[PDB]
Enzyme design. Structure first.
Site, PDB file in Angstrom:
ATOM      1  N   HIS A 181      25.124 -11.477   6.293  1.00  0.00           N
ATOM      2  CA  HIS A 181      25.401 -12.898   6.370  1.00  0.00           C
ATOM      3  C   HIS A 181      24.151 -13.723   6.573  1.00  0.00           C
ATOM      4  O   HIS A 181      24.254 -14.937   6.750  1.00  0.00           O
ATOM      5  CB  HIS A 181      26.386 -13.173   7.501  1.00  0.00           C
TER       6      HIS A 181
ATOM      7  N   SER B 109      24.663 -12.494  -1.001  1.00  0.00           N
ATOM      8  CA  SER B 109      24.846 -11.463  -2.007  1.00  0.00           C
ATOM      9  C   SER B 109      23.709 -11.449  -3.018  1.00  0.00           C
ATOM     10  O   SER B 109      22.903 -12.372  -3.112  1.00  0.00           O
ATOM     11  CB  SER B 109      26.157 -11.665  -2.759  1.00  0.00           C
TER      12      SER B 109
ATOM     13  N   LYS C  32      40.629 -13.835  -6.736  1.00  0.00           N
ATOM     14  CA  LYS C  32      40.174 -12.757  -7.596  1.00  0.00           C
ATOM     15  C   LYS C  32      40.202 -11.429  -6.859  1.00  0.00           C
ATOM     16  O   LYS C  32      40.320 -10.327  -7.458  1.00  0.00           O
ATOM     17  CB  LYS C  32      38.775 -13.039  -8.040  1.00  0.00           C
ATOM     18  N   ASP C  33      40.164 -11.541  -5.549  1.00  0.00           N
ATOM     19  CA  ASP C  33      40.263 -10.436  -4.623  1.00  0.00           C
ATOM     20  C   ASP C  33      41.693  -9.973  -4.431  1.00  0.00           C
ATOM     21  O   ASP C  33      41.938  -8.800  -4.464  1.00  0.00           O
ATOM     22  CB  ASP C  33      39.557 -10.732  -3.285  1.00  0.00           C
TER      23      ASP C  33
ATOM     24  N   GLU D  82      39.211  21.033  -1.524  1.00  0.00           N
ATOM     25  CA  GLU D  82      39.757  19.878  -2.220  1.00  0.00           C
ATOM     26  C   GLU D  82      38.677  19.247  -3.097  1.00  0.00           C
ATOM     27  O   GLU D  82      37.481  19.392  -2.849  1.00  0.00           O
ATOM     28  CB  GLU D  82      40.323  18.866  -1.225  1.00  0.00           C
TER      29      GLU D  82
HETATM   30  C1  HEM Z   1      33.763   2.230   5.180  1.00  0.00           C
HETATM   31  C2  HEM Z   1      32.704   2.103   4.380  1.00  0.00           C
HETATM   32  C3  HEM Z   1      32.200   0.766   3.777  1.00  0.00           C
HETATM   33  C4  HEM Z   1      32.728  -0.459   3.809  1.00  0.00           C
HETATM   34  C5  HEM Z   1      34.038  -0.929   4.459  1.00  0.00           C
HETATM   35  C6  HEM Z   1      31.845  -1.334   3.090  1.00  0.00           C
HETATM   36  C7  HEM Z   1      32.044  -2.671   2.898  1.00  0.00           C
HETATM   37  C8  HEM Z   1      31.223  -3.549   2.249  1.00  0.00           C
HETATM   38  C9  HEM Z   1      31.570  -4.899   1.948  1.00  0.00           C
HETATM   39  C10 HEM Z   1      32.904  -5.572   2.293  1.00  0.00           C
HETATM   40  C11 HEM Z   1      30.563  -5.472   1.324  1.00  0.00           C
HETATM   41  C12 HEM Z   1      30.675  -6.947   0.880  1.00  0.00           C
HETATM   42  C13 HEM Z   1      29.824  -7.293  -0.326  1.00  0.00           C
HETATM   43  C14 HEM Z   1      30.538  -6.868  -1.558  1.00  0.00           C
HETATM   44  O1  HEM Z   1      31.779  -6.835  -1.514  1.00  0.00           O
HETATM   45  O2  HEM Z   1      29.876  -6.557  -2.569  1.00  0.00           O
HETATM   46  C15 HEM Z   1      29.491  -4.482   1.203  1.00  0.00           C
HETATM   47  C16 HEM Z   1      28.226  -4.600   0.648  1.00  0.00           C
HETATM   48  C17 HEM Z   1      27.250  -3.614   0.598  1.00  0.00           C
HETATM   49  N1  HEM Z   1      27.431  -2.295   1.000  1.00  0.00           N
HETATM   50 FE1  HEM Z   1      29.099  -1.484   1.919  1.00  0.00          FE
HETATM   51  N2  HEM Z   1      30.774  -0.622   2.636  1.00  0.00           N
HETATM   52  C18 HEM Z   1      30.967   0.674   3.042  1.00  0.00           C
HETATM   53  C19 HEM Z   1      30.116   1.707   2.786  1.00  0.00           C
HETATM   54  C20 HEM Z   1      28.861   1.570   2.268  1.00  0.00           C
HETATM   55  C21 HEM Z   1      27.984   2.647   1.943  1.00  0.00           C
HETATM   56  C22 HEM Z   1      28.282   4.141   2.114  1.00  0.00           C
HETATM   57  C23 HEM Z   1      26.857   2.154   1.475  1.00  0.00           C
HETATM   58  C24 HEM Z   1      25.736   3.104   1.054  1.00  0.00           C
HETATM   59  C25 HEM Z   1      24.542   2.669   0.714  1.00  0.00           C
HETATM   60  C26 HEM Z   1      26.957   0.704   1.469  1.00  0.00           C
HETATM   61  C27 HEM Z   1      26.034  -0.245   1.070  1.00  0.00           C
HETATM   62  C28 HEM Z   1      26.259  -1.587   0.805  1.00  0.00           C
HETATM   63  C29 HEM Z   1      25.308  -2.521   0.253  1.00  0.00           C
HETATM   64  C30 HEM Z   1      23.853  -2.218  -0.133  1.00  0.00           C
HETATM   65  C31 HEM Z   1      25.882  -3.711   0.120  1.00  0.00           C
HETATM   66  C32 HEM Z   1      25.100  -4.917  -0.435  1.00  0.00           C
HETATM   67  C33 HEM Z   1      25.914  -5.812  -1.346  1.00  0.00           C
HETATM   68  C34 HEM Z   1      25.128  -6.362  -2.507  1.00  0.00           C
HETATM   69  O3  HEM Z   1      24.370  -5.635  -3.187  1.00  0.00           O
HETATM   70  O4  HEM Z   1      25.285  -7.569  -2.756  1.00  0.00           O
HETATM   71  N3  HEM Z   1      28.208   0.392   1.965  1.00  0.00           N
HETATM   72  N4  HEM Z   1      29.955  -3.316   1.791  1.00  0.00           N
END
Ligand code: HEM
Ligand code: PEE
Ligand code: HEC
Ligand code: HEM
Ligand code: FES
Lengths: 71, 64, 241, 51, 378, 106, 98
Positions: free
Chosen positions: E200, E204, E226-227, E270
């Site tokens: 935040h 993005s 859209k979500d 699995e």
């Molecule tokens: C329970 C697991 C996870 C949840 C709930 C989660 C959730 C989210 C959410 C809600 C966003 C909002 C931005 C979007 O929707 O694009 C986001 C962005 C992001 N997440 Fe996760 N994520 C998870 C696991 C991971 C993992 C394993 C990685 C591994 C690298 C990761 C890396 C990122 C990154 C780099 C962004 C940046 C968004 C962008 O490039 O604009 N997340 N994540």
């Protein structure tokens, strides 16, 4: 980091129009179909060749395992 | 009983006769000498597989 | 290093998509289990409370509880007495313990018959192809004193002795009691025992493909009429000369 | 790399290898007490904390 | 005045998703984070009734599962949700992680490092769960792995007795595995409000690379409708699979009842651990194998420090586009190989396939990006 | 390093220019670079006529993508008409940083 | 197991060099005629059907593996021989195995 504090910008104009004054599908099957074309075309010359290889190895491997037991 | 009638009907097609021809050739050679190694379980397997494949399309029709 | 034969595929009346289980092959399939299979196999998870509305009327199968009366446990001053049996009671198990099975059945514990359908590659067509299969031993294979030949079984030699042939049973209806049809009406009884859910859920998958149908092109319409302002905007740039 | 190359970062490194060495020593010895690590609890027979 | 702005509580949700700048050209590959958010939330409401009626005892371990399927009202529905809503959870997670790499999203130091910790934590929760049902695969995974962490240089002997809470798998097993498989979800809904608090403060990314402050757009109503469309389309796929063909994914070896004695013929896991199992089995010896299995999760961390490029993302880069697709095609050859015996011809492909997972990441993407720099003069 | 092959380096550079596709959106090579702390400095050292142009080539080519289309073929940025506007301001922010860092070393 | 001496001689007839993991039974159990065993197999863990084996031990069809009677491995991919349970033969008729 809210809207009034983001950047400075000069001499440009925009020309919107209402939602209740127009239509949602101007041209549904005359634009979308030639659209998907240029897209896929431009791109399925570097996405397919990698996946041909996994098919060639897959058929070469089950053939060998089968003829080593059943002569 | 209805299966007993259809099995020889489904053995009529030539998909199953050829492997049947193969079974006898090794079968007599194996019994000719007690010194042979082959057990005809393999040549058995081709015959049952081909026969029971063609029985499948029909037998449920010729029931009750 | 021995190969295994795979059962083919047959056209069952309950095969796919939307089609159900006809309750006559199942009505005529408990009896083939009852007067042949049972005296060795167990059905412990399966109880007489289940069949009140699938194959028989409530008192029609209630009367099958009196056919055999199960041994009971501790009651007053004279426990270990016998009770006629009622609606709740389970499928009576043959032995005192399963360890008795190796005593009489050559040290081969009989598989239970509650999940035998799901616990096998093949399914309800592996069992059927097992039954009619029994064949001749080929030239040059030895066997134990108490073993039988079957090209489907992975070891090709199973203890069990062929329990179905012609005229084994008398159907209550009069359909020709032949090996071909007794085998089919056993492969239908066991499947429904593996699942009691196979028919309730094919009906909640058709009344749901209709709620989605009605509601999944109406959210698409709202979404599309918010992004039109945004999708039809033109733009300028006349700078100072 | 080149942003960190020099004598001053090597001097800070040799100046704070006391910091790294004490930090690691305290961490290693604490990791023995925390998990009821008998295998180093015996290297000194002076802590008879196992009842 | 304006109520949302001045209230002390509404003031917080207004800055988070009603009114924040968002980019114009965000695609549908940015919909998976919210799906995961939806995906994580089913699994806690389901998993509640599977312990409420659940009994933790050794003797009833096999029988408690088959019991709950038929006897319990509406139990046949809810049981196959827990097992099928957890194969969904792992297909919205290899899509999310893949997407970030393509568009250069790991230049957020704060958030790409809090995410690799979340990837180990959900692997563990899944691998206890397979071991609860107990039947003739839960037991015969448990021996394999549990035994092999006994090849630690100086501590491995002491650990297999604690987790067993006995000589080996025992009545206490329900007590602990349930105990640690119960705990894990609630640490994951804490590292997610921290994974998002570090984002935040930059906002993005977008599928172009370049930075776009000259046209932002609110977050309402443009990505909150859209979500919704996205999430509905997902309930549709998750429900074709449990009301028509539930059993398509599992293995028909699980059911065979609880026996220490019996021999499972064809052990294998699995479907979403079958690329791990092909690594461990590819190398001789106990101690070198466990090191090649932790290496992969630990390799994602060397990510930002291997970047050699003037541009961010692969959108404008043809040569580096092709490789992307190779790493992916070659993670489909480690899922096919790992679900079969060692084999006469399956050992040679089987351990040629693995190194390459390593060669491309550590040697060939850094080199190839330089020839692109040199070829348009930076 | 080669001379007789510099015709071939030109040949490969005209092919890689077209295969990458920023010209169908109107952009120029310097529009694509990644903005770190050193490229964020060399941007506020630009005169006003150069800085205003860059903010319209980046807003018209990020609206064509929201609509999944491309600009007409007569308006594609040619090969021999791309001018490197941000290059000279960037060699100077850099060589002033190697100087503040070999002072702390000596 | 209350082992028969003929099976101890079957075990002792084995030639040492061919063996995958050196663990002779005469040092494994202080009693040749008794044996104490843990089910798990060193490679994966699967447990054979009782009274199986060409050589007189145990046969796991998991990967064609054969374990010896006293807890030894002769064929792969099993790494080593069967782990020896902690025990103490304190009483001649009331054994403390652990
Ligand atoms: C329970 C697991 C996870 C949840 C709930 C989660 C959730 C989210 C959410 C809600 C966003 C909002 C931005 C979007 O929707 O694009 C986001 C962005 C992001 N997440 Fe996760 N994520 C998870 C696991 C991971 C993992 C394993 C990685 C591994 C690298 C990761 C890396 C990122 C990154 C780099 C962004 C940046 C968004 C962008 O490039 O604009 N997340 N994540
Ligand atoms: C089966 C396995 C999954 C197969 C998915 C195949 C998807 C095929 C459709 C996507 C290809 C396509 O449509 O064209 C390419 C298309 C071009 O789009 P632009 O970004 O606009 O580029 C414009 C100019 N080039 O490429 C893309 O969209 C790529 C989108 C991101 C890919 C995300 C897919 C994730 C699959 C890879 C996962 C493997 C890594 C997992 C890491 C886990 C580590 C333990
Ligand atoms: C007491 C004799 C006996 C009779 C009669 C009998 N069963 Fe069997 N059943 C067994 C034994 C013994 C086995 C296998 C035990 C073993 O192989 O270790 C077996 C196996 C089975 C199997 C599985 C076969 C397999 O290959 O695994 C089914 C199904 C079954 N019984 C049900 C039936 C049915 C149906 C019938 C009537 C056709 C029947 N039983 C009659 C004792 C019997
Ligand atoms: C990411 C989250 C989770 C994943 C991936 C997951 C996965 C699994 C899997 C694969 C099984 C196998 C059981 C089967 O095959 O039917 C299982 C069983 C089980 N899980 Fe989870 N689970 C998750 C969260 C939870 C939570 C929050 C609970 C809370 C109590 C829970 C409790 C259980 C229980 C009690 C079983 C019992 C075994 C059974 O009934 O079959 N799980 N889980
Ligand atoms: S004992 Fe190792 S795989 Fe069977």
């Amino acid at each position: 980091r809210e809207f009034g504090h983001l950047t400075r910008m000069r001499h440009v104009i925009t020309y919107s129009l209402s939602p209740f004054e127009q239509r949602a599908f101007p041209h549904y099957f005359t634009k979308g179909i030639p659209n998907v074309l240029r897209r896929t075309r431009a791109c399925i010359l570097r996405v397919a060749p990698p996946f041909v290889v996994f098919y060639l190895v897959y058929t070469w491997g089950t053939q060998e395992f089968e003829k080593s037991k059943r002569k | 009983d209805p299966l007993t009638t259809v099995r020889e009907q489904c053995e009529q097609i030539e998909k199953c006769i050829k492997a049947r021809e193969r079974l006898e050739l090794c079968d007599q050679r194996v019994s000719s000498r007690s010194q042979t190694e082959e057990d005809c379980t393999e040549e058995l397997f081709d015959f049952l597989h081909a026969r029971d494949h063609c029985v499948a399309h029909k037998l449920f029709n010729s029931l009750k | 290093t021995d190969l295994e034969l795979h059962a083919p595929s047959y056209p069952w009346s309950h095969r796919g998509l939307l089609s159900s289980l006809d309750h006559t092959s199942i009505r005529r399939g408990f009896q083939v289990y009852k007067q042949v299979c049972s005296s060795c196999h167990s059905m412990d998870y399966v109880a007489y409370r289940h069949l009140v509305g699938v194959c028989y009327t409530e008192e029609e199968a209630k009367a099958l509880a009196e056919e055999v009366e199960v041994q009971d446990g501790p009651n007053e001053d004279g426990e270990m007495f016998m009770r006629p049996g009622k609606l709740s009671d389970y499928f009576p198990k043959p032995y005192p313990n399963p360890e008795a099975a190796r005593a009489a059945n050559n040290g081969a514990l009989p598989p239970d018959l509650s999940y035998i359908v799901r616990a096998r590659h093949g399914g309800e067509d592996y069992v059927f192809s097992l039954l009619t299969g029994y064949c001749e031993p080929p030239t040059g294979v030895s066997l134990r004193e108490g073993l039988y030949f079957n090209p489907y079984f992975p070891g090709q030699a199973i203890a069990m002795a062929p329990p179905i042939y012609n005229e084994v049973l008398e159907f209550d209806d009069g359909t020709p009691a032949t090996m071909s049809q007794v085998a089919k009406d056993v492969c239908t009884f066991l499947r429904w025992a593996s699942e009691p859910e196979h028919d309730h859920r094919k009906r909640m998958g058709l009344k749901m493909l209709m709620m989605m149908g009605l509601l999944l092109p109406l959210v698409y319409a709202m979404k599309r009429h918010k992004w039109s302002v945004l999708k039809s905007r033109k733009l300028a740039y006349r700078p100072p000369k | 790399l080149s942003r960190f190359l020099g004598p001053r970062y090597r001097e800070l490194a040799r100046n704070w290898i006391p910091t790294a060495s004490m930090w690691g020593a305290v961490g290693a010895v604490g990791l023995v007490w925390a998990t009821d690590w008998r295998l180093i609890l015996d290297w000194v027979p002076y802590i008879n904390g196992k009842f | 005045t304006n109520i949302r702005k001045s209230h002390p509580l509404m003031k917080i949700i207004n800055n988070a998703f009603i009114d924040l700048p968002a980019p114009s050209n965000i695609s549908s590959w940015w919909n998976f984070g919210s799906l995961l958010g939806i995906c994580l939330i089913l699994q806690i409401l389901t998993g509640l009734f599977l312990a409420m009626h659940y009994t933790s005892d050794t003797t009833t371990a096999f029988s408690s599962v088959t019991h709950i399927c038929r006897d319990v009202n509406y139990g046949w529905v809810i049981r196959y949700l827990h097992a099928n809503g957890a194969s969904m959870f792992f297909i919205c997670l290899f899509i999310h992680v893949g997407r970030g790499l393509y568009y250069g999203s790991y230049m957020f130091l704060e958030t790409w490092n809090i995410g690799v910790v979340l990837l180990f934590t959900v692997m563990a929760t899944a691998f206890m769960g397979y071991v609860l049902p107990w039947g003739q695969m839960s037991f015969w995974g448990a021996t394999v792995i549990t035994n092999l962490l006994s090849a630690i240089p100086y501590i491995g002997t002491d650990l297999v007795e604690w987790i067993w809470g006995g000589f080996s798998v025992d009545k206490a097993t329900l007590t602990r595995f349930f105990a640690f498989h119960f705990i894990l979800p609630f640490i994951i809904t804490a590292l997610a409000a921290v994974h998002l608090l570090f984002l935040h403060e930059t906002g993005s990314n977008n599928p172009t690379g370049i930075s776009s402050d000259m046209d932002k757009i609110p977050f309402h109503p443009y990505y909150t409708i859209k979500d919704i469309l996205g999430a509905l389309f997902m309930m549709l796929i998750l429900l074709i699979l449990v009301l028509f063909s539930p059993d398509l994914l599992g293995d028909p070896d699980n059911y065979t009842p609880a026996n220490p004695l019996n021999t499972p013929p064809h052990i294998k896991p699995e479907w979403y651990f079958l690329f791990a199992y092909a690594i461990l089995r590819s190398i001789p010896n106990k101690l070198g194998g466990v090191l090649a299995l932790v290496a992969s999760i630990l390799i994602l961390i060397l990510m930002p420090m291997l970047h050699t490029s003037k541009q961010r993302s692969m959108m404008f880069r043809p040569l580096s586009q092709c490789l992307f697709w190779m790493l992916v095609a070659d993670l489909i050859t480690l899922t096919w190989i790992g679900g079969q015996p060692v084999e006469h011809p399956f050992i040679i492909i089987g351990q040629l396939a693995s190194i390459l997972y390593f060669l491309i990441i550590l040697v060939l993407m850094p080199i190839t990006s330089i020839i692109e720099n040199n070829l348009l003069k930076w | 390093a080669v001379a007789a092959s510099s015709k071939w380096l030109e040949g490969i550079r005209k092919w890689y220019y077209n295969a990458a596709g920023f010209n169908k959106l109107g952009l120029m090579r310097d529009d694509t670079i990644y903005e770190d702390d050193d490229v964020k400095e060399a941007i506020r050292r630009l005169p006003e006529n150069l800085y205003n142009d860059r903010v319209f080539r980046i807003k018209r080519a990020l609206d064509l993508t929201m609509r999944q289309q491309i600009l007409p073929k007569e308006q594609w940025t040619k090969y021999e008409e791309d001018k490197f506007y941000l290059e000279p301001y960037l060699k100077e922010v850099i060589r002033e940083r190697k100087e503040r860092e070999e002072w702390a070393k000596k | 197991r209350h082992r028969t001496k003929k099976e101890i001689d079957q075990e002792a007839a084995v030639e040492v060099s061919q063996l995958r993991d050196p663990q002779h039974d005469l040092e494994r159990v202080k009693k040749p005629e008794w044996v104490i065993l843990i089910g798990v197999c060193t490679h994966l863990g699967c447990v054979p059907i009782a009274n199986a084996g060409d050589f007189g031990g145990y046969y796991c069809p998991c990967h064609g593996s054969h374990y010896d009677a006293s807890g030894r491995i002769r064929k792969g991919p099993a790494p080593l021989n069967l782990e020896v349970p902690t025990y103490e033969f304190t009483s001649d008729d009331l054994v403390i195995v652990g």
